[PDB]
């Protein structure tokens, strides 16, 4: 649903309510301003028409009416300023309150609620929803009330002057209002139509953009493009249809307006000739009622914007309804004083609310005394991390009761409990500040002496000594600037500065070497005597010196006691220890050069539109002229009929002209967007992996540029030409005709024209909005908001809500003041222009009264000059408001030209190279070194070497991140190494054909990803440029043992799978990845983590096809499960990129090295 109206203005103080009341009154005055001017104008032409009697007191009467005009103008100046300022101020203050409350409401939130909610929604929902609320409660409400008052005032003034004419204009007033509203809503910045049309197509893009490396692995660069192109043509067609309808309705509005002119003048002349009404009376009635009925149309976009704001505010109020079930700041919590090391767990059952169907825990009972180093051992999946999280009050347990030193947690304070438990998690995150602040985040008042003692306790001072800015170094995002060991050591320091009572480590020495882990554990025993400690780790070196060792099994703690007790117990831990022992140019036109005819037709119609405002004026003036001259009735009647008929024909010409101009420019614009998007997508696919490595272009640049390139280039060429041509025609010819009829008055008015044009632009731009280009202003605040999400894992040790909230509010302080100032400024400008219109009326007609008094020019001629120039200036401003900006378009087009030129010598579209007819299948690496282009300082390789022969099952064992997938990427022509020599059967890959190597082989990915089609097309993707037989499909499905799961599904080989296979399970998509790779029949086969998520009966049926098909083809398997490693032919072990051991499996098992400690992990 949507919020209530009253809850929208809930955060508004009484001061802001006063602002709203006065702003409403100001808008009502400002709205009643215009029809009164038209009333004065009617009376003024009535005087001018009698001035020449068979000129006396002309200048006097025109002085009187100039005073009237000036007074109305000044009143409107005051009302406009008040109305704008007060509403912008009220909206700004309220939005500041809402941002603060929102950011604070998300802080408490709920444990695991963040995992449920989307990360992108939490960062995006915020800015989008809040900016959408601001627009709805901002000046739009003020303009709505202004329009209402204008409508009522116009109708009242009309009804008072003459009722007969206003009855007819009322009879036609519904259609006028509907037309104005439909015209405006289409014209109300309809960029949402493109995002709606491209919404389907865009999706496909991101799928590709999600996994470019996989799309590189299989031959789908060409196959996806066609799938992208076919999606694109539909949005192209829908857009072309949308442009036809918009222009039809706009032209129909124009026809209706001019038809109302014709009807009003026909009936009004019938009234004037009969003596019922005078001429000025008719002009007053007509223009007042027309303006009112036309402001009813202006009222509508604001109604839509208000509804949209309500819709987006509903969610935010829901967010503040959320309750974490833990009060971080209710000072009603209970705080102990004689805190002593003690842990009590009894009958503890708990499950994750994300997946509540599965029960990990089935009760665990523990009692841990003070100073008792308790280690827990067990394979991954039992919930070591779960107990950790279930220890610092993150979640509450569903069964039992947990206590700490007598009393239970469920009645004491959470924050006081949270500060006293120093915990390091598995993978820590580090705030992107200086390292003095990072290590300061433990507690408030820490001097640099305690800092140094802490870091020296952490033994993380050497790498502090070597780097510059020893306390001022700004660590990069997510610990990317420093190494992992330095990172985990300072994380230990960051925990120790709290001086805790209970210490909880969780995989504290994952990537750490021998001596630093040794000195870390000695420091941990240096500060364990006063505290209770629980340590979780995989290395048994830091475990053997503990107090108590225990073991998880199925969530229940089974084995208890000391080291020797589990030695004589001969359980799983006795099995473990038994086994262990820039440039800017203009080329835009050329991009659209091909579509030369459309523009031509367009240009022509644009000329005619320019000629619609001067021509109007001429006709307009002459009709009034007919009642100024002294003629018999019949002459007045037939001239008036002629000119009214001219109005009708002018409306029809405008209808056809608008239709043609809009149609042709829209057709050319959509064809341009299609061609351009196709070219850019193609070039993105053609680009090298290095181009994808740069983090600017990783997700958002490539996705954004594809939607930003279409919308802009059309504004760069077509809109620019249409608007410049139409304005030049209009203003030029109007000024020329005015020059010829009177030269003094034209110069006088030219002095004032620019103000009227920029006035129209300001008006329309007020309707459109400010676009919120304040990422620079809101930049630090958004950084803080994102880093709170990032460090949400670090929030667990110390919530630090107040610290982040203070940083964020301090960030917001500057935009708030700036925004109040900006609101004042915008009010001043809008008011000045809105008044300058009426001032211009006054001055022009007083100067013209002087002129008529001395017979320098006729009244019809001054009226023609004024009408032409003024109305031309208004139309000029209006037209220049619809055009998009040339600057944005130009910078986009430059980026695009840069994208297309980029060529990383991929050599995928070229045949040239070495093409032998034959091969053997022998690979020889030598002295091969590789450095990532995005990390040029950090080497991950130090010159490995390898020898692979036919059918040689070569295992590659190492730590996580020791150049495992790198050799895959070295083979697959992703990166070409700076140094080294690779001989593929005595044929260097650098001289071969590039696609031939990518054709012969075929691998499985580290993560399985599929495409947005069925599973037949998933497996069919493996083989390209080839007629894919379905017998191979079902044969591969059987060989991968996925046949059963496909034949079990309804619409078996047509079952539509979503993105990345998010419908079916992980093992099944891994198997279908096996099947997809299987149809390649590679002479060289690579497996990377072939059993990451798979059952033990499925691993065998996977490996049987491998074993029967490993013959004849070279096979290279990389995995952590030793099952495929025992049967391998040869085995290579890596350490920081260096080959340490190689040869047969029995040789490495004979000489006990690091591979003996590797294989002997869980066996026995």
């Amino acid at each position, epitope marked *: 649903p949507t919020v209530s109206v009253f809850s929208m203005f809930r955060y508004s103080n009484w001061l802001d309510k006063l602002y709203m009341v006065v702003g409403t009154l100001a808008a009502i005055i400002h709205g009643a301003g215009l029809p009164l001017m038209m009333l004065v104008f009617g009376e003024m032409t009535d005087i001018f028409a009698n001035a020449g009697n068979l000129f006396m007191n002309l200048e006097e009467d025109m002085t009187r009416y100039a005073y009237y005009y000036s007074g109305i103008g000044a009143g409107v100046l005051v009302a406009a300023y008040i109305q704008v300022s007060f509403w912008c101020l009220a909206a700004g203050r309220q939005i500041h309150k809402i941002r603060k409350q929102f950011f604070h409401a998300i802080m408490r939130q709920e444990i695991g609620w963040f995992d449920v909610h989307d990360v992108g929604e939490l960062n995006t929902r915020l800015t989008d929803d809040v900016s959408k609320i601001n627009e709805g409660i901002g000046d739009k409400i003020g303009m709505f009330f202004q329009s209402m008052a204008t409508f009522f005032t116009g109708f009242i003034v009309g009804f008072t002057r003459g009722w007969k004419l206003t009855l007819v204009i009322l009879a036609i007033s519904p259609v006028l209002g509907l037309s104005a509203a439909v015209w405006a809503k289409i014209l109300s910045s309809f960029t949402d139509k493109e995002l709606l049309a491209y919404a389907k197509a865009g999706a496909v893009a991101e799928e590709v953009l999600a996994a470019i490396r996989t799309v590189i692995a299989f031959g789908g660069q060409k196959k996806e493009l066609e799938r992208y192109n076919k999606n694109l043509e539909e949005a192209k067609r829908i857009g072309i249809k949308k442009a036809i309808t918009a222009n039809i309705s706009i032209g129909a509005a124009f026809l209706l307006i001019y038809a109302s002119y014709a009807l009003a003048f026909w009936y009004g002349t019938t009234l004037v000739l009969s003596g019922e009404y005078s001429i000025g009376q008719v002009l007053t009635v007509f223009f007042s009622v027309l303006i009112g009925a036309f402001s009813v149309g202006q009222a509508s976009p604001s109604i839509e914007a208000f509804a949209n704001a309500r819709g987006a505010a509903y969610e935010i109020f829901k967010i503040i309804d959320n309750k974490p079930s833990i009060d971080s700041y209710s000072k009603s919590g209970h705080k102990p004083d004689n805190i002593k090391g003690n842990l009590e767990f009894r009958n503890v059952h708990f499950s994750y609310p994300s997946r509540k169907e599965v029960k990990i825990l089935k009760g665990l009972n523990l009692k841990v005394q003070s100073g008792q180093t308790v280690a827990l051992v067990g394979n991954s999946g039992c919930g070591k991390s779960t107990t950790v999280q279930l220890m610092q009050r993150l979640y509450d347990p569903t069964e039992g009761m947990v206590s700490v030193d007598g009393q239970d947690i469920r009645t004491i304070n959470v924050r006081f409990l949270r500060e006293i438990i120093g915990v390091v998690s598995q993978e820590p995150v580090l705030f992107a500040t200086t390292i003095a602040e990072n290590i300061r985040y433990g507690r408030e008042n820490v001097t640099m002496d305690e800092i140094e003692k802490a870091v020296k306790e952490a033994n993380a001072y050497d790498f502090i000594m070597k780097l510059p800015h020893k306390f001022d170094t700004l660590v990069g995002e997510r610990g990317a600037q420093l190494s992992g060991g330095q990172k985990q050591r300072i994380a230990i320091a960051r925990a120790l500065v709290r001086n805790p009572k209970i210490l909880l480590l969780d995989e504290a020495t994952s990537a750490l070497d021998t001596e630093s882990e040794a000195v870390v554990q000695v420091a941990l025993d240096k500060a364990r005597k006063g505290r209770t400690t629980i340590v979780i780790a995989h290395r048994l070196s830091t475990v053997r010196n503990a107090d108590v060792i225990a073991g998880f099994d199925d969530g229940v703690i089974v084995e208890k006691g000391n080291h020797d007790e589990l030695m004589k117990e001969k359980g799983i831990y006795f099995k473990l220890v038994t086994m262990q022992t820039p440039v800017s140019f203009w080329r835009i036109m050329k991009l659209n050069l091909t579509e030369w005819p459309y523009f031509v037709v367009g240009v022509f119609c644009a000329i005619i539109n320019g000629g619609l405002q001067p021509a109007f004026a001429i006709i307009f003036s002459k009709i009034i002229g007919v009642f100024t001259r002294i003629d018999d009735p019949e*002459t007045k009647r037939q001239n008036s009929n002629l000119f009214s008929l001219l109005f009708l024909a002018l409306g029809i010409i405008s209808f056809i002209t608008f239709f043609l101009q809009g149609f042709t420019f829209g057709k050319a614009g959509e064809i341009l967007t299609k061609r351009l998007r196709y070219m850019v997508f193609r070039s993105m696919l053609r680009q090298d992996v290095s181009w994808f490595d740069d983090p600017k272009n990783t997700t958002g640049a490539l996705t954004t540029r594809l939607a930003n390139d279409a919308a802009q280039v059309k504004g760069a060429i077509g809109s620019r030409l249409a608007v410049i041509t139409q304005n030049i025609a209009n203003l030029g010819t109007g000024i020329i005709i005015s020059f010829i009829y009177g030269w003094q008055l034209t110069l006088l008015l030219l002095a004032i024209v620019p103000i009227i044009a920029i006035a129209g632009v300001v008006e329309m731009k007020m309707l459109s909005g400010q676009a919120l280009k304040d990422k620079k202003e809101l930049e630090g605040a958004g950084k803080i908001a994102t880093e709170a999400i990032e460090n949400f894992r670090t929030v667990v040790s110390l919530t630090q809500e107040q610290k982040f909230e203070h940083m964020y509010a301090q960030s917001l302080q500057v935009p708030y003041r700036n925004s109040l100032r900006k609101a004042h400024i915008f009010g001043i400008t809008f008011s000045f222009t809105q008044a300058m219109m009426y001032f211009s009326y006054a001055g022009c007609f007083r100067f013209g009264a002087y002129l008529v008094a001395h017979k320098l020019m006729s009244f019809e001629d001054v009226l023609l000059v004024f009408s032409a120039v003024v109305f031309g200036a208004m139309a000029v401003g209006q037209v220049s408001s619809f055009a998009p900006d040339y600057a944005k378009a130009k910078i986009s087009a430059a980026h695009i030209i840069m994208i297309i030129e980029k060529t990383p010598l991929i050599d995928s579209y070229s045949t040239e190279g070495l093409m032998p007819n034959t091969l053997e299948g022998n690979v020889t690496f030598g002295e091969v070194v590789f450095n990532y282009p995005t990390r040029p300082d950090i080497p991950v390789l130090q010159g490995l070497s390898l020898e692979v022969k036919k059918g040689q099952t070569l295992a590659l064992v190492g730590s996580s991140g020791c150049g495992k997938s790198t050799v895959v990427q070295l083979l697959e022509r992703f990166y070409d190494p700076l140094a080294g020599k690779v001989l593929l059967d005595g044929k260097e890959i650098k001289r071969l054909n590039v696609q031939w190597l990518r054709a012969h082989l075929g691998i499985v990915s580290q993560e399985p990803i599929l495409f947005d089609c069925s599973i037949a097309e998933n497996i069919a993707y493996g083989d390209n440029s080839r007629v894919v037989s379905q017998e191979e499909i079902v044969r591969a499905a059987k060989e991968a043992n996925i046949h059963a799961f496909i034949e079990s599904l309804p619409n078996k080989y047509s079952t539509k799978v979503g993105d990345k296979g998010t419908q079916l399970s992980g093992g099944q998509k891994q198997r279908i990845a096996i099947a997809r790779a299987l149809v390649r029949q590679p002479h060289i086969l690579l497996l990377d983590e072939a059993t990451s998520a798979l059952d033990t009966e499925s691993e065998k049926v996977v490996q049987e096809a491998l074993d029967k098909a490993r013959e004849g083809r070279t096979c290279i398997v990389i995995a952590h499960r030793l099952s495929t490693i025992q049967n391998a032919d040869l085995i290579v072990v890596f350490q920081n990129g260096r080959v340490k051991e190689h040869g047969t499996h029995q040789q490495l098992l004979a000489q006990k090295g690091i591979y003996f400690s590797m294989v002997s992990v869980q066996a026995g």
Partner: antibody
Amino acid sequence: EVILVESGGGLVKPGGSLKLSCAASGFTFSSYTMSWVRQTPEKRLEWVATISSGGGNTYYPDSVKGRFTISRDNAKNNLYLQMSSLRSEDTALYYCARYYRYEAWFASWGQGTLVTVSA
Amino acid sequence: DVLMTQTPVSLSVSLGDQASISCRSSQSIVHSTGNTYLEWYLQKPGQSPKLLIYKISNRFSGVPDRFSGSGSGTDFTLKISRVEAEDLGVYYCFQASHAPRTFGGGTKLEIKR
């Protein structure tokens, strides 16, 4: 005041042609409608022509239509009556007349100029 | 077309007396707008004609008040009360409502002495 002086009257043979002119001073010639009226020697007046202020519309009765023509120079302030295919029933005194507001047809009259058509 | 006939052709009024001229058309003189266009002109001997009443009841600028015009339907009469010796002359009634415009004729006035 309002001064209308017309001239161009002589003797012409039946079936010939003639051209009359009327110069006007003291008012804006281009803002008034102008008429030509004819008075026979039987003291019976008759309407002859009418031209609007712009000169766009021209009204003749169904007795001289197609033979006569009326024209006007607003820059020189002159009114011209071009005649052709004369007749014995055109011997008469011609006045140029002005048009009053409040829908009065003839406010200011000329002096009259005589036109005789015979052999 | 439309013909206008004055009821009297000649009228002899002593100085100080009053008298009325009536101008009857056959077709009713009513324009499409609604106004009725009837004017009365006077031509003194040896002078161009001068406008007397510019709509059945109105009076041109400078016209003396003793001229009084009243008109009903298709019968229209101008009556002068206490006519002076200067005001004698020939009177015509002009009608400009239909597309041919015609004058009446006649109405000679002779002051008795």
